[PDB]
Amino acid sequence: MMFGRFTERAQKVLALAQEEALRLGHNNIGTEHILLGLVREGEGIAAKALQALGLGSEKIQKEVESLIGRGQEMSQTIHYTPRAKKVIELSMDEARKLGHSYVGTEHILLGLIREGEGVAARVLNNLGVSLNKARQQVLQLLGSN
């Protein structure tokens, strides 16, 4: 058996990533759309950790949309990019490394920073969040704070 399961909180950020892809006029979910889906949820442990590090939904949204743009729409329904598919595997590896039997919002963000080269990692670094800053706030705020 393997932890091919996401929390209801995490499934909501991934559903918001589809709504945000369709708002931007994209038929795909990237690392960018998963990070944008996180701040559009705003209460999940990862989004709460981003805001605890001094970020905010408009800051992350404006930096995402300034890097990926708008208007490539084709009414084609959503697909995951190779990096978003990698983040789904890496967040599941981070959940297994923590001994959690499903992937939380926390573990989605640990996947986004573990990818390290997609737009999500670059938005965090250009705002001022870093791999170890995000790890320490997420790893505390998930239940050890």
Side-chain angles (χ1 to χ4, degrees), residues 73-113:
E73 185 55 57
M74 208 167 290
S75 304
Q76 195 244 248
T77 309
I78 257 63
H79 291 132
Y80 283 67
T81 69
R83 297 191 187 272
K85 188 181 295 183
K86 204 194 304 169
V87 169
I88 294 300
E89 293 185 275
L90 291 172
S91 57
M92 195 184 298
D93 180 68
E94 290 287 327
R96 176 169 43 50
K97 278 177 165 65
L98 262 65
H100 280 233
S101 56
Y102 38 66
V103 190
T105 67
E106 43 267 72
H107 303 104
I108 288 175
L109 182 54
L110 299 191
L112 291 170
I113 23 158

PDB file of all heavy atoms in Angstrom, residues 73-113:
ATOM      1  N   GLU A  73      -6.519  30.321 -23.574  1.00  0.00           N
ATOM      2  CA  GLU A  73      -7.718  29.522 -23.303  1.00  0.00           C
ATOM      3  C   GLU A  73      -8.292  28.863 -24.567  1.00  0.00           C
ATOM      4  O   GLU A  73      -8.344  29.472 -25.639  1.00  0.00           O
ATOM      5  CB  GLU A  73      -8.761  30.425 -22.618  1.00  0.00           C
ATOM      6  CG  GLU A  73     -10.038  29.707 -22.161  1.00  0.00           C
ATOM      7  CD  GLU A  73      -9.751  28.512 -21.240  1.00  0.00           C
ATOM      8  OE1 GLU A  73      -9.104  28.689 -20.183  1.00  0.00           O
ATOM      9  OE2 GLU A  73     -10.154  27.385 -21.606  1.00  0.00           O
ATOM     10  N   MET A  74      -8.750  27.616 -24.426  1.00  0.00           N
ATOM     11  CA  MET A  74      -9.218  26.764 -25.526  1.00  0.00           C
ATOM     12  C   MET A  74     -10.427  25.876 -25.149  1.00  0.00           C
ATOM     13  O   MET A  74     -10.820  25.004 -25.926  1.00  0.00           O
ATOM     14  CB  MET A  74      -8.004  25.950 -26.018  1.00  0.00           C
ATOM     15  CG  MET A  74      -8.096  25.550 -27.495  1.00  0.00           C
ATOM     16  SD  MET A  74      -6.544  24.917 -28.201  1.00  0.00           S
ATOM     17  CE  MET A  74      -5.538  26.434 -28.235  1.00  0.00           C
ATOM     18  N   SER A  75     -11.021  26.076 -23.963  1.00  0.00           N
ATOM     19  CA  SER A  75     -12.134  25.283 -23.397  1.00  0.00           C
ATOM     20  C   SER A  75     -11.832  23.775 -23.351  1.00  0.00           C
ATOM     21  O   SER A  75     -12.693  22.936 -23.628  1.00  0.00           O
ATOM     22  CB  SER A  75     -13.468  25.610 -24.089  1.00  0.00           C
ATOM     23  OG  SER A  75     -13.752  27.002 -24.019  1.00  0.00           O
ATOM     24  N   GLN A  76     -10.582  23.430 -23.020  1.00  0.00           N
ATOM     25  CA  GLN A  76     -10.014  22.084 -23.156  1.00  0.00           C
ATOM     26  C   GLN A  76      -9.994  21.244 -21.861  1.00  0.00           C
ATOM     27  O   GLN A  76      -9.553  20.093 -21.892  1.00  0.00           O
ATOM     28  CB  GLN A  76      -8.627  22.243 -23.820  1.00  0.00           C
ATOM     29  CG  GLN A  76      -7.999  20.954 -24.387  1.00  0.00           C
ATOM     30  CD  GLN A  76      -6.697  20.564 -23.684  1.00  0.00           C
ATOM     31  OE1 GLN A  76      -5.613  20.606 -24.254  1.00  0.00           O
ATOM     32  NE2 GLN A  76      -6.743  20.171 -22.431  1.00  0.00           N
ATOM     33  N   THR A  77     -10.468  21.784 -20.729  1.00  0.00           N
ATOM     34  CA  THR A  77     -10.334  21.186 -19.377  1.00  0.00           C
ATOM     35  C   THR A  77      -8.860  21.053 -18.934  1.00  0.00           C
ATOM     36  O   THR A  77      -7.936  21.144 -19.744  1.00  0.00           O
ATOM     37  CB  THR A  77     -11.146  19.872 -19.260  1.00  0.00           C
ATOM     38  OG1 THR A  77     -12.472  20.097 -19.707  1.00  0.00           O
ATOM     39  CG2 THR A  77     -11.279  19.321 -17.836  1.00  0.00           C
ATOM     40  N   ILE A  78      -8.610  20.927 -17.627  1.00  0.00           N
ATOM     41  CA  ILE A  78      -7.262  21.002 -17.036  1.00  0.00           C
ATOM     42  C   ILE A  78      -6.440  19.709 -17.192  1.00  0.00           C
ATOM     43  O   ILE A  78      -6.960  18.595 -17.102  1.00  0.00           O
ATOM     44  CB  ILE A  78      -7.360  21.523 -15.575  1.00  0.00           C
ATOM     45  CG1 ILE A  78      -6.941  23.007 -15.487  1.00  0.00           C
ATOM     46  CG2 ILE A  78      -6.548  20.729 -14.537  1.00  0.00           C
ATOM     47  CD1 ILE A  78      -7.861  23.946 -16.275  1.00  0.00           C
ATOM     48  N   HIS A  79      -5.126  19.893 -17.355  1.00  0.00           N
ATOM     49  CA  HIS A  79      -4.069  18.872 -17.292  1.00  0.00           C
ATOM     50  C   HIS A  79      -2.944  19.349 -16.361  1.00  0.00           C
ATOM     51  O   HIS A  79      -2.745  20.551 -16.199  1.00  0.00           O
ATOM     52  CB  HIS A  79      -3.517  18.599 -18.702  1.00  0.00           C
ATOM     53  CG  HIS A  79      -4.476  17.897 -19.636  1.00  0.00           C
ATOM     54  ND1 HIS A  79      -4.763  18.284 -20.949  1.00  0.00           N
ATOM     55  CD2 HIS A  79      -5.142  16.735 -19.366  1.00  0.00           C
ATOM     56  CE1 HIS A  79      -5.600  17.348 -21.434  1.00  0.00           C
ATOM     57  NE2 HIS A  79      -5.848  16.411 -20.504  1.00  0.00           N
ATOM     58  N   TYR A  80      -2.182  18.438 -15.754  1.00  0.00           N
ATOM     59  CA  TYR A  80      -1.037  18.795 -14.901  1.00  0.00           C
ATOM     60  C   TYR A  80       0.252  18.874 -15.735  1.00  0.00           C
ATOM     61  O   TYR A  80       0.521  17.983 -16.546  1.00  0.00           O
ATOM     62  CB  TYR A  80      -0.911  17.802 -13.731  1.00  0.00           C
ATOM     63  CG  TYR A  80      -1.911  18.029 -12.605  1.00  0.00           C
ATOM     64  CD1 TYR A  80      -3.291  17.827 -12.817  1.00  0.00           C
ATOM     65  CD2 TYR A  80      -1.459  18.448 -11.336  1.00  0.00           C
ATOM     66  CE1 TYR A  80      -4.212  18.074 -11.782  1.00  0.00           C
ATOM     67  CE2 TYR A  80      -2.377  18.689 -10.295  1.00  0.00           C
ATOM     68  CZ  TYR A  80      -3.760  18.506 -10.519  1.00  0.00           C
ATOM     69  OH  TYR A  80      -4.658  18.735  -9.523  1.00  0.00           O
ATOM     70  N   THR A  81       1.069  19.914 -15.530  1.00  0.00           N
ATOM     71  CA  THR A  81       2.407  20.007 -16.152  1.00  0.00           C
ATOM     72  C   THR A  81       3.355  18.934 -15.591  1.00  0.00           C
ATOM     73  O   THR A  81       3.099  18.408 -14.501  1.00  0.00           O
ATOM     74  CB  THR A  81       3.057  21.393 -15.973  1.00  0.00           C
ATOM     75  OG1 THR A  81       3.411  21.612 -14.624  1.00  0.00           O
ATOM     76  CG2 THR A  81       2.177  22.546 -16.452  1.00  0.00           C
ATOM     77  N   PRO A  82       4.488  18.625 -16.255  1.00  0.00           N
ATOM     78  CA  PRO A  82       5.493  17.709 -15.709  1.00  0.00           C
ATOM     79  C   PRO A  82       6.000  18.120 -14.317  1.00  0.00           C
ATOM     80  O   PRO A  82       6.209  17.256 -13.467  1.00  0.00           O
ATOM     81  CB  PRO A  82       6.624  17.681 -16.743  1.00  0.00           C
ATOM     82  CG  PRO A  82       5.899  17.986 -18.052  1.00  0.00           C
ATOM     83  CD  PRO A  82       4.845  19.003 -17.617  1.00  0.00           C
ATOM     84  N   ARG A  83       6.122  19.429 -14.041  1.00  0.00           N
ATOM     85  CA  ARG A  83       6.509  19.943 -12.713  1.00  0.00           C
ATOM     86  C   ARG A  83       5.381  19.862 -11.687  1.00  0.00           C
ATOM     87  O   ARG A  83       5.653  19.519 -10.542  1.00  0.00           O
ATOM     88  CB  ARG A  83       7.048  21.377 -12.795  1.00  0.00           C
ATOM     89  CG  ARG A  83       8.326  21.492 -13.630  1.00  0.00           C
ATOM     90  CD  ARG A  83       8.938  22.883 -13.430  1.00  0.00           C
ATOM     91  NE  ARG A  83      10.083  23.104 -14.329  1.00  0.00           N
ATOM     92  CZ  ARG A  83      11.346  22.802 -14.097  1.00  0.00           C
ATOM     93  NH1 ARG A  83      11.770  22.202 -13.026  1.00  0.00           N
ATOM     94  NH2 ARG A  83      12.268  23.106 -14.957  1.00  0.00           N
ATOM     95  N   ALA A  84       4.125  20.098 -12.066  1.00  0.00           N
ATOM     96  CA  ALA A  84       2.992  19.914 -11.160  1.00  0.00           C
ATOM     97  C   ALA A  84       2.809  18.431 -10.798  1.00  0.00           C
ATOM     98  O   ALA A  84       2.650  18.100  -9.626  1.00  0.00           O
ATOM     99  CB  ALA A  84       1.743  20.511 -11.806  1.00  0.00           C
ATOM    100  N   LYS A  85       2.945  17.523 -11.776  1.00  0.00           N
ATOM    101  CA  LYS A  85       2.983  16.068 -11.556  1.00  0.00           C
ATOM    102  C   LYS A  85       4.138  15.673 -10.623  1.00  0.00           C
ATOM    103  O   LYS A  85       3.925  14.915  -9.675  1.00  0.00           O
ATOM    104  CB  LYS A  85       3.057  15.369 -12.924  1.00  0.00           C
ATOM    105  CG  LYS A  85       2.895  13.843 -12.814  1.00  0.00           C
ATOM    106  CD  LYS A  85       2.997  13.132 -14.172  1.00  0.00           C
ATOM    107  CE  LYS A  85       1.857  13.516 -15.128  1.00  0.00           C
ATOM    108  NZ  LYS A  85       1.937  12.758 -16.405  1.00  0.00           N
ATOM    109  N   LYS A  86       5.326  16.265 -10.811  1.00  0.00           N
ATOM    110  CA  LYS A  86       6.467  16.111  -9.891  1.00  0.00           C
ATOM    111  C   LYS A  86       6.128  16.597  -8.476  1.00  0.00           C
ATOM    112  O   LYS A  86       6.406  15.882  -7.525  1.00  0.00           O
ATOM    113  CB  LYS A  86       7.714  16.814 -10.458  1.00  0.00           C
ATOM    114  CG  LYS A  86       9.020  16.228  -9.898  1.00  0.00           C
ATOM    115  CD  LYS A  86      10.245  17.112 -10.180  1.00  0.00           C
ATOM    116  CE  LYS A  86      10.448  17.428 -11.671  1.00  0.00           C
ATOM    117  NZ  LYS A  86      11.467  18.493 -11.861  1.00  0.00           N
ATOM    118  N   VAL A  87       5.461  17.742  -8.310  1.00  0.00           N
ATOM    119  CA  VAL A  87       5.011  18.258  -6.998  1.00  0.00           C
ATOM    120  C   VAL A  87       3.988  17.334  -6.332  1.00  0.00           C
ATOM    121  O   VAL A  87       4.066  17.142  -5.121  1.00  0.00           O
ATOM    122  CB  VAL A  87       4.473  19.699  -7.127  1.00  0.00           C
ATOM    123  CG1 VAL A  87       3.743  20.215  -5.879  1.00  0.00           C
ATOM    124  CG2 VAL A  87       5.646  20.648  -7.387  1.00  0.00           C
ATOM    125  N   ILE A  88       3.084  16.701  -7.084  1.00  0.00           N
ATOM    126  CA  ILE A  88       2.161  15.682  -6.550  1.00  0.00           C
ATOM    127  C   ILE A  88       2.929  14.453  -6.019  1.00  0.00           C
ATOM    128  O   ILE A  88       2.599  13.941  -4.951  1.00  0.00           O
ATOM    129  CB  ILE A  88       1.096  15.324  -7.617  1.00  0.00           C
ATOM    130  CG1 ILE A  88       0.152  16.512  -7.941  1.00  0.00           C
ATOM    131  CG2 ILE A  88       0.270  14.083  -7.235  1.00  0.00           C
ATOM    132  CD1 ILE A  88      -0.673  17.067  -6.769  1.00  0.00           C
ATOM    133  N   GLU A  89       3.997  14.012  -6.694  1.00  0.00           N
ATOM    134  CA  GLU A  89       4.868  12.933  -6.192  1.00  0.00           C
ATOM    135  C   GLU A  89       5.763  13.373  -5.016  1.00  0.00           C
ATOM    136  O   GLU A  89       5.930  12.624  -4.051  1.00  0.00           O
ATOM    137  CB  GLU A  89       5.731  12.369  -7.333  1.00  0.00           C
ATOM    138  CG  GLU A  89       4.903  11.627  -8.390  1.00  0.00           C
ATOM    139  CD  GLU A  89       5.817  10.978  -9.447  1.00  0.00           C
ATOM    140  OE1 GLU A  89       6.217  11.662 -10.420  1.00  0.00           O
ATOM    141  OE2 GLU A  89       6.138   9.770  -9.315  1.00  0.00           O
ATOM    142  N   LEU A  90       6.321  14.587  -5.057  1.00  0.00           N
ATOM    143  CA  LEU A  90       7.228  15.115  -4.031  1.00  0.00           C
ATOM    144  C   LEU A  90       6.488  15.470  -2.735  1.00  0.00           C
ATOM    145  O   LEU A  90       6.988  15.172  -1.655  1.00  0.00           O
ATOM    146  CB  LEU A  90       7.996  16.333  -4.578  1.00  0.00           C
ATOM    147  CG  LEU A  90       9.037  16.012  -5.671  1.00  0.00           C
ATOM    148  CD1 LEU A  90       9.569  17.326  -6.251  1.00  0.00           C
ATOM    149  CD2 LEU A  90      10.212  15.180  -5.153  1.00  0.00           C
ATOM    150  N   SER A  91       5.282  16.035  -2.809  1.00  0.00           N
ATOM    151  CA  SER A  91       4.433  16.261  -1.628  1.00  0.00           C
ATOM    152  C   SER A  91       4.003  14.948  -0.964  1.00  0.00           C
ATOM    153  O   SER A  91       3.949  14.859   0.262  1.00  0.00           O
ATOM    154  CB  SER A  91       3.207  17.106  -1.985  1.00  0.00           C
ATOM    155  OG  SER A  91       2.431  16.526  -3.013  1.00  0.00           O
ATOM    156  N   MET A  92       3.788  13.893  -1.755  1.00  0.00           N
ATOM    157  CA  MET A  92       3.516  12.543  -1.258  1.00  0.00           C
ATOM    158  C   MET A  92       4.753  11.897  -0.608  1.00  0.00           C
ATOM    159  O   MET A  92       4.636  11.251   0.434  1.00  0.00           O
ATOM    160  CB  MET A  92       2.943  11.720  -2.416  1.00  0.00           C
ATOM    161  CG  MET A  92       2.285  10.427  -1.942  1.00  0.00           C
ATOM    162  SD  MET A  92       1.692   9.354  -3.284  1.00  0.00           S
ATOM    163  CE  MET A  92       0.458  10.442  -4.053  1.00  0.00           C
ATOM    164  N   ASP A  93       5.949  12.127  -1.157  1.00  0.00           N
ATOM    165  CA  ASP A  93       7.221  11.729  -0.541  1.00  0.00           C
ATOM    166  C   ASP A  93       7.503  12.484   0.774  1.00  0.00           C
ATOM    167  O   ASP A  93       7.916  11.866   1.752  1.00  0.00           O
ATOM    168  CB  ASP A  93       8.355  11.916  -1.558  1.00  0.00           C
ATOM    169  CG  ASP A  93       9.716  11.518  -0.975  1.00  0.00           C
ATOM    170  OD1 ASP A  93       9.938  10.310  -0.724  1.00  0.00           O
ATOM    171  OD2 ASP A  93      10.574  12.401  -0.758  1.00  0.00           O
ATOM    172  N   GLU A  94       7.213  13.786   0.844  1.00  0.00           N
ATOM    173  CA  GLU A  94       7.302  14.587   2.076  1.00  0.00           C
ATOM    174  C   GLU A  94       6.300  14.110   3.145  1.00  0.00           C
ATOM    175  O   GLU A  94       6.663  13.990   4.316  1.00  0.00           O
ATOM    176  CB  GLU A  94       7.070  16.075   1.757  1.00  0.00           C
ATOM    177  CG  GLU A  94       8.209  16.729   0.956  1.00  0.00           C
ATOM    178  CD  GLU A  94       9.493  16.988   1.758  1.00  0.00           C
ATOM    179  OE1 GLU A  94       9.449  17.271   2.974  1.00  0.00           O
ATOM    180  OE2 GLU A  94      10.588  17.009   1.150  1.00  0.00           O
ATOM    181  N   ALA A  95       5.066  13.763   2.756  1.00  0.00           N
ATOM    182  CA  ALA A  95       4.074  13.178   3.661  1.00  0.00           C
ATOM    183  C   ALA A  95       4.536  11.821   4.224  1.00  0.00           C
ATOM    184  O   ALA A  95       4.479  11.606   5.437  1.00  0.00           O
ATOM    185  CB  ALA A  95       2.731  13.071   2.929  1.00  0.00           C
ATOM    186  N   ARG A  96       5.079  10.937   3.370  1.00  0.00           N
ATOM    187  CA  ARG A  96       5.659   9.646   3.782  1.00  0.00           C
ATOM    188  C   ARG A  96       6.894   9.818   4.680  1.00  0.00           C
ATOM    189  O   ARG A  96       6.999   9.110   5.681  1.00  0.00           O
ATOM    190  CB  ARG A  96       5.932   8.791   2.529  1.00  0.00           C
ATOM    191  CG  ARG A  96       6.642   7.462   2.855  1.00  0.00           C
ATOM    192  CD  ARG A  96       6.699   6.442   1.700  1.00  0.00           C
ATOM    193  NE  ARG A  96       7.021   6.997   0.365  1.00  0.00           N
ATOM    194  CZ  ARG A  96       8.003   7.804   0.003  1.00  0.00           C
ATOM    195  NH1 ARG A  96       8.927   8.231   0.808  1.00  0.00           N
ATOM    196  NH2 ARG A  96       8.091   8.250  -1.213  1.00  0.00           N
ATOM    197  N   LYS A  97       7.779  10.784   4.399  1.00  0.00           N
ATOM    198  CA  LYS A  97       8.929  11.138   5.262  1.00  0.00           C
ATOM    199  C   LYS A  97       8.503  11.618   6.657  1.00  0.00           C
ATOM    200  O   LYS A  97       9.178  11.304   7.639  1.00  0.00           O
ATOM    201  CB  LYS A  97       9.801  12.202   4.570  1.00  0.00           C
ATOM    202  CG  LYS A  97      10.774  11.589   3.550  1.00  0.00           C
ATOM    203  CD  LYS A  97      11.565  12.688   2.822  1.00  0.00           C
ATOM    204  CE  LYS A  97      12.789  12.148   2.068  1.00  0.00           C
ATOM    205  NZ  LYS A  97      12.420  11.247   0.948  1.00  0.00           N
ATOM    206  N   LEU A  98       7.369  12.316   6.762  1.00  0.00           N
ATOM    207  CA  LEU A  98       6.750  12.718   8.035  1.00  0.00           C
ATOM    208  C   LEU A  98       5.898  11.613   8.699  1.00  0.00           C
ATOM    209  O   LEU A  98       5.439  11.794   9.829  1.00  0.00           O
ATOM    210  CB  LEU A  98       5.941  14.017   7.819  1.00  0.00           C
ATOM    211  CG  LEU A  98       6.712  15.282   8.233  1.00  0.00           C
ATOM    212  CD1 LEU A  98       7.954  15.541   7.378  1.00  0.00           C
ATOM    213  CD2 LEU A  98       5.798  16.502   8.134  1.00  0.00           C
ATOM    214  N   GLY A  99       5.675  10.477   8.029  1.00  0.00           N
ATOM    215  CA  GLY A  99       4.833   9.378   8.515  1.00  0.00           C
ATOM    216  C   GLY A  99       3.320   9.651   8.458  1.00  0.00           C
ATOM    217  O   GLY A  99       2.547   8.936   9.100  1.00  0.00           O
ATOM    218  N   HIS A 100       2.882  10.674   7.714  1.00  0.00           N
ATOM    219  CA  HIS A 100       1.461  10.979   7.490  1.00  0.00           C
ATOM    220  C   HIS A 100       0.887  10.075   6.392  1.00  0.00           C
ATOM    221  O   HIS A 100       1.457   9.966   5.306  1.00  0.00           O
ATOM    222  CB  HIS A 100       1.273  12.464   7.131  1.00  0.00           C
ATOM    223  CG  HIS A 100       1.291  13.409   8.310  1.00  0.00           C
ATOM    224  ND1 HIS A 100       0.294  14.347   8.599  1.00  0.00           N
ATOM    225  CD2 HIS A 100       2.261  13.499   9.267  1.00  0.00           C
ATOM    226  CE1 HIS A 100       0.690  14.981   9.717  1.00  0.00           C
ATOM    227  NE2 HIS A 100       1.868  14.491  10.138  1.00  0.00           N
ATOM    228  N   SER A 101      -0.271   9.461   6.651  1.00  0.00           N
ATOM    229  CA  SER A 101      -0.937   8.504   5.749  1.00  0.00           C
ATOM    230  C   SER A 101      -1.775   9.154   4.629  1.00  0.00           C
ATOM    231  O   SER A 101      -2.568   8.484   3.958  1.00  0.00           O
ATOM    232  CB  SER A 101      -1.737   7.491   6.577  1.00  0.00           C
ATOM    233  OG  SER A 101      -2.665   8.138   7.440  1.00  0.00           O
ATOM    234  N   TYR A 102      -1.617  10.465   4.443  1.00  0.00           N
ATOM    235  CA  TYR A 102      -2.194  11.297   3.385  1.00  0.00           C
ATOM    236  C   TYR A 102      -1.414  12.617   3.261  1.00  0.00           C
ATOM    237  O   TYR A 102      -0.696  13.023   4.176  1.00  0.00           O
ATOM    238  CB  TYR A 102      -3.686  11.570   3.655  1.00  0.00           C
ATOM    239  CG  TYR A 102      -4.070  11.799   5.107  1.00  0.00           C
ATOM    240  CD1 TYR A 102      -3.604  12.927   5.809  1.00  0.00           C
ATOM    241  CD2 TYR A 102      -4.887  10.857   5.763  1.00  0.00           C
ATOM    242  CE1 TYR A 102      -3.947  13.110   7.162  1.00  0.00           C
ATOM    243  CE2 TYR A 102      -5.233  11.034   7.114  1.00  0.00           C
ATOM    244  CZ  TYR A 102      -4.761  12.163   7.821  1.00  0.00           C
ATOM    245  OH  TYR A 102      -5.089  12.347   9.130  1.00  0.00           O
ATOM    246  N   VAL A 103      -1.572  13.300   2.128  1.00  0.00           N
ATOM    247  CA  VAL A 103      -0.906  14.569   1.801  1.00  0.00           C
ATOM    248  C   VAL A 103      -1.763  15.759   2.252  1.00  0.00           C
ATOM    249  O   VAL A 103      -2.881  15.939   1.764  1.00  0.00           O
ATOM    250  CB  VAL A 103      -0.613  14.634   0.288  1.00  0.00           C
ATOM    251  CG1 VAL A 103       0.291  15.820  -0.052  1.00  0.00           C
ATOM    252  CG2 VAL A 103       0.066  13.358  -0.229  1.00  0.00           C
ATOM    253  N   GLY A 104      -1.254  16.570   3.183  1.00  0.00           N
ATOM    254  CA  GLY A 104      -1.887  17.816   3.637  1.00  0.00           C
ATOM    255  C   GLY A 104      -1.514  19.042   2.790  1.00  0.00           C
ATOM    256  O   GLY A 104      -0.659  18.968   1.904  1.00  0.00           O
ATOM    257  N   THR A 105      -2.118  20.199   3.086  1.00  0.00           N
ATOM    258  CA  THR A 105      -1.745  21.493   2.468  1.00  0.00           C
ATOM    259  C   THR A 105      -0.277  21.830   2.752  1.00  0.00           C
ATOM    260  O   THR A 105       0.466  22.228   1.856  1.00  0.00           O
ATOM    261  CB  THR A 105      -2.629  22.659   2.957  1.00  0.00           C
ATOM    262  OG1 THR A 105      -2.438  22.968   4.322  1.00  0.00           O
ATOM    263  CG2 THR A 105      -4.117  22.398   2.757  1.00  0.00           C
ATOM    264  N   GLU A 106       0.151  21.573   3.988  1.00  0.00           N
ATOM    265  CA  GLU A 106       1.527  21.599   4.473  1.00  0.00           C
ATOM    266  C   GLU A 106       2.468  20.818   3.541  1.00  0.00           C
ATOM    267  O   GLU A 106       3.438  21.375   3.025  1.00  0.00           O
ATOM    268  CB  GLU A 106       1.569  21.065   5.927  1.00  0.00           C
ATOM    269  CG  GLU A 106       0.725  19.815   6.252  1.00  0.00           C
ATOM    270  CD  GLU A 106      -0.690  20.142   6.778  1.00  0.00           C
ATOM    271  OE1 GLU A 106      -1.544  20.593   5.975  1.00  0.00           O
ATOM    272  OE2 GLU A 106      -0.955  19.918   7.982  1.00  0.00           O
ATOM    273  N   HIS A 107       2.142  19.557   3.244  1.00  0.00           N
ATOM    274  CA  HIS A 107       2.949  18.686   2.389  1.00  0.00           C
ATOM    275  C   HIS A 107       2.945  19.122   0.920  1.00  0.00           C
ATOM    276  O   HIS A 107       3.981  18.996   0.268  1.00  0.00           O
ATOM    277  CB  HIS A 107       2.471  17.241   2.548  1.00  0.00           C
ATOM    278  CG  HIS A 107       2.509  16.757   3.974  1.00  0.00           C
ATOM    279  ND1 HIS A 107       1.393  16.606   4.800  1.00  0.00           N
ATOM    280  CD2 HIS A 107       3.637  16.496   4.694  1.00  0.00           C
ATOM    281  CE1 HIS A 107       1.877  16.261   6.005  1.00  0.00           C
ATOM    282  NE2 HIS A 107       3.216  16.174   5.965  1.00  0.00           N
ATOM    283  N   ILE A 108       1.846  19.697   0.406  1.00  0.00           N
ATOM    284  CA  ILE A 108       1.822  20.339  -0.923  1.00  0.00           C
ATOM    285  C   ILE A 108       2.889  21.438  -1.004  1.00  0.00           C
ATOM    286  O   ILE A 108       3.687  21.434  -1.942  1.00  0.00           O
ATOM    287  CB  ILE A 108       0.413  20.868  -1.292  1.00  0.00           C
ATOM    288  CG1 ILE A 108      -0.523  19.677  -1.599  1.00  0.00           C
ATOM    289  CG2 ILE A 108       0.470  21.813  -2.508  1.00  0.00           C
ATOM    290  CD1 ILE A 108      -1.980  20.076  -1.865  1.00  0.00           C
ATOM    291  N   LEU A 109       2.960  22.339  -0.014  1.00  0.00           N
ATOM    292  CA  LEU A 109       3.988  23.383   0.002  1.00  0.00           C
ATOM    293  C   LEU A 109       5.393  22.791   0.116  1.00  0.00           C
ATOM    294  O   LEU A 109       6.259  23.191  -0.659  1.00  0.00           O
ATOM    295  CB  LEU A 109       3.687  24.420   1.091  1.00  0.00           C
ATOM    296  CG  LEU A 109       4.674  25.603   1.177  1.00  0.00           C
ATOM    297  CD1 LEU A 109       4.853  26.352  -0.147  1.00  0.00           C
ATOM    298  CD2 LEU A 109       4.152  26.616   2.196  1.00  0.00           C
ATOM    299  N   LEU A 110       5.612  21.790   0.980  1.00  0.00           N
ATOM    300  CA  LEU A 110       6.901  21.085   1.038  1.00  0.00           C
ATOM    301  C   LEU A 110       7.289  20.475  -0.327  1.00  0.00           C
ATOM    302  O   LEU A 110       8.461  20.520  -0.695  1.00  0.00           O
ATOM    303  CB  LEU A 110       6.921  20.028   2.160  1.00  0.00           C
ATOM    304  CG  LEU A 110       6.718  20.548   3.599  1.00  0.00           C
ATOM    305  CD1 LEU A 110       7.043  19.448   4.609  1.00  0.00           C
ATOM    306  CD2 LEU A 110       7.582  21.764   3.925  1.00  0.00           C
ATOM    307  N   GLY A 111       6.321  19.997  -1.118  1.00  0.00           N
ATOM    308  CA  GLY A 111       6.519  19.574  -2.510  1.00  0.00           C
ATOM    309  C   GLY A 111       6.916  20.719  -3.457  1.00  0.00           C
ATOM    310  O   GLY A 111       7.860  20.564  -4.231  1.00  0.00           O
ATOM    311  N   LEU A 112       6.253  21.881  -3.373  1.00  0.00           N
ATOM    312  CA  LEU A 112       6.556  23.077  -4.184  1.00  0.00           C
ATOM    313  C   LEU A 112       7.998  23.580  -3.972  1.00  0.00           C
ATOM    314  O   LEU A 112       8.709  23.833  -4.947  1.00  0.00           O
ATOM    315  CB  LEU A 112       5.547  24.204  -3.870  1.00  0.00           C
ATOM    316  CG  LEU A 112       4.100  23.954  -4.339  1.00  0.00           C
ATOM    317  CD1 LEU A 112       3.169  25.020  -3.759  1.00  0.00           C
ATOM    318  CD2 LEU A 112       3.961  24.023  -5.859  1.00  0.00           C
ATOM    319  N   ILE A 113       8.462  23.681  -2.718  1.00  0.00           N
ATOM    320  CA  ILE A 113       9.858  24.069  -2.409  1.00  0.00           C
ATOM    321  C   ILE A 113      10.874  22.946  -2.696  1.00  0.00           C
ATOM    322  O   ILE A 113      11.996  23.249  -3.106  1.00  0.00           O
ATOM    323  CB  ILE A 113      10.047  24.619  -0.969  1.00  0.00           C
ATOM    324  CG1 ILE A 113       8.969  24.164   0.028  1.00  0.00           C
ATOM    325  CG2 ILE A 113      10.129  26.156  -1.003  1.00  0.00           C
ATOM    326  CD1 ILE A 113       9.358  24.220   1.504  1.00  0.00           C
TER     327      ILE A 113
END
